[PDB]
Amino acid sequence: KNNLGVAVIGSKQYAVNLLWGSSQDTETTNQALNKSLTLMSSKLYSVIGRFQGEQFAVGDKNIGHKRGQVTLLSAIDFDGSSFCGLFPADNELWLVIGVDKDGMVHFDKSFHSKDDAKKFFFDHVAYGYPWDRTYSPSDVGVGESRSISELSLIKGKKLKEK
Structure with a gap:
């Protein structure tokens, strides 16, 4: 077990590196989530609601996830x-x-290595979707240099168990 799944931002701790998903077709969010939990042999989850619909996160206890942790992505405001x-x-x-x-x-x-994170960012994220905004450190030069702490937050949703 490692702690790759827990990030610290200021005085707050957040669950990161969760498996996110949403239902498709005639599948309900509840069914999609339970199928994901079964597939991952996990009991940690969180359902978050957005205007365009709902989605869920499945935690991994092997990287430090535990009931009660606020998931970072749920805490980042969507405008x-x-x-x-x-x-x-x-x-x-x-x-x-x-x-x-x-x-x-x-x-x-989440990554313990900056090089691995930078590589993932460039290979799959930075150009994988028409993002309205893109952020990265100055030495990276993609989009604007902003800290997570500079993003707008809201009360996040905590991981639940079972």
């Missing part, structure tokens, strides 16, 4: 504009996130 970014957390962890025009989480990844 109708999509965004992605490479961000350093306060605890030696790098985060790569991405939310689409409908508020659906496309990316929620």
